[PDB]
Amino acid sequence: SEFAFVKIASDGKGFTRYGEPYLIRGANYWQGMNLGADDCSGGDRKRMELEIKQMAEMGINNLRVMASSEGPDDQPYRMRPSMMPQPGKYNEGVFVGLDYLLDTMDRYNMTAVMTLGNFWQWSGGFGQYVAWITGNQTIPYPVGDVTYDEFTQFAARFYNDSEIAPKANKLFKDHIYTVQNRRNTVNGKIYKEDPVIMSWQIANAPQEAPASWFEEISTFIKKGAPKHLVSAGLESKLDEYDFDRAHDHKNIDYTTCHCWVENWGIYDPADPDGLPHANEYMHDFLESRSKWAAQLNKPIVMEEFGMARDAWRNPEDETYKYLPSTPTSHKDEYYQKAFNQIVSLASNRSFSGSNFWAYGGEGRSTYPPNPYGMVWLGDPPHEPHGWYSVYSNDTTVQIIKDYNANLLKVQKELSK
Numbered sequence: 001s002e003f004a005f006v007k008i009a010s011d012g013k014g015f016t017r018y019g020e021p022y023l024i025r026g027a028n029y030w031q032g033m034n035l036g037a038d039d040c041s042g043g044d045r046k047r048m049e050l051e052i053k054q055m056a057e058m059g060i061n062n063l064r065v066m067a068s069s070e071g072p073d074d075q076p077y078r079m080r081p082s083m084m085p086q087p088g089k090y091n092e093g094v095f096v097g098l099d100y101l102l103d104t105m106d107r108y109n110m111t112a113v114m115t116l117g118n119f120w121q122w123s124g125g126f127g128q129y130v131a132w133i134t135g136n137q138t139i140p141y142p143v144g145d146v147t148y149d150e151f152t153q154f155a156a157r158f159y160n161d162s163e164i165a166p167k168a169n170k171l172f173k174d175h176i177y178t179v180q181n182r183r184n185t186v187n188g189k190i191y192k193e194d195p196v197i198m199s200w201q202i203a204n205a206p207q208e209a210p211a212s213w214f215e216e217i218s219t220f221i222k223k224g225a226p227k228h229l230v231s232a233g234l235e236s237k238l239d240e241y242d243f244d245r246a247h248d249h250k251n252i253d254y255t256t257c258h259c260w261v262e263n264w265g266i267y268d269p270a271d272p273d274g275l276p277h278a279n280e281y282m283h284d285f286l287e288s289r290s291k292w293a294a295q296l297n298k299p300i301v302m303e304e305f306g307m308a309r310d311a312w313r314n315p316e317d318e319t320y321k322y323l324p325s326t327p328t329s330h331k332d333e334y335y336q337k338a339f340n341q342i343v344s345l346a347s348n349r350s351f352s353g354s355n356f357w358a359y360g361g362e363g364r365s366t367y368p369p370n371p372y373g374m375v376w377l378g379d380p381p382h383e384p385h386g387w388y389s390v391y392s393n394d395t396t397v398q399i400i401k402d403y404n405a406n407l408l409k410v411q412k413e414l415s416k
């Protein structure tokens with residue numbers, strides 16, 4: 001019986017599970033694995049269990065999590081301790097964190113999108129694999145005078161450099177194999193047989209990877225886990241051509257987009273008048289990506305989006321922007337409008353849900369780092385702590401809760 005496995009509907013316009021439509025009432029929780037680790041490897045398991053419980057009470061049925069991270073552990077801007085400090089060598093204390101993450105998600109009947117790698121630097125990612133291959137541990141982190149474009153050209157050698165790509169992909173493939181074949185030490189399930197996992201996701205946000213790379217990798221992931229969906233992890237921030245290069249492949253089962261107004265220069269959170277322009281952008285983003293998904297006849301999930309706190313209330317004070325006590329009136333309206341639009345599109349089966357970025361839970365940006373230097377919450381350590389996290393008692397919690405109720409209501413209407 002594969003009844004419990006999330007599937008694509010035979011008409012391609014949404015997901016199914018248990019013989020019924022399945023809508024994604026999601027959140028991002030990439031920190032789950034590290035919080036699930038035992039106290040010795042810097043975890044806080046009781047807090048992870050409470051965070052999952054908090055999320056179940058807000059109606060969340062789906063977490064996108066990180067199922068990779070690379071050392072070596074002396075690197076800035078990344079998760080510590082790492083899951084894979086050197087190629088093929090695993091921090092078992094961190095890996096057991098993933099086991100518990102998946103076991104707790106099961107008890108709350110959530111599904112997981114298992115992200116297998118990262119283009120960005122905060123879990124090591126593609127840039128780290130490249131560093132292992134060239135033997136050169138000086139990654140050009142985009143801090144100070146180094147730009148994102150320069151870091152991107154370095155990391156993109158993972159799949160564009162005809163000498164580096166085959167060796168890098170060999171290491172990445174060994175990691176994919178190890179994760180798909182992990183026996184969960186808590187409940188005994190082998191990951192590739194676990195219906196709790198909705199999909200394997202190639203990577204977070206690959207930047208202009210060639211078509212033949214998505215073709216190859218997705219095929220390999222699917223042969224590795226034939227019961228599961230496979231996903232690309234693309235932002236879809238460019239155009240339809242870019243979207244097709246990632247998604248038009250027999251083993252990419254559904255499509256995704258990521259919407260970042262501040263990061264793309266669309267939205268300035270210090271500007272008291274900037275919200276309407278971000279709302280409109282979110283608005284055309286959802287309508288146009290929706291059309292691109294429909295042209296491939298595959299489902300679409302907005303698997304990342306977010307907004308900063310109300311920095312415009314005190315524009316000239318940088319620290320104010322990240323304080324938990326700072327309100328989120330813009331973020332709240334932005335989330336609410338996007339959610340209302342998704343609910344309306346999902347009613348005509350032209351969108352399948354979303355995962356906000358990202359749940360902070362009980363973490364706060366004012367807390368001290370743990371002994372490995374981590375202030376765990378929704379913002380990875382390449383970014384200011386507290387930028388986008390949604391905290392357990394934020395006003396945005398009610399908005400997300402209502403959205404998850406509306407989206408479940410729609411899934412029920414469609415199940416008739």
Ligand SMILES: OC[C@H]1O[C@@H](O[C@@H]2[C@@H](CO)O[C@](O)(CO)[C@H]2O)[C@@H](O)[C@@H](O)[C@@H]1O
Nearest residue numbers: 120148204205235260263304379380383
């Ligand atoms: O910044 C929030 C969240 O965004 C994702 O990555 C962003 C992408 C979005 O376009 O662009 C960057 O800002 C680099 O320019 C990158 O950090 C998300 O996947 C995660 O990495 C990040 O926390």
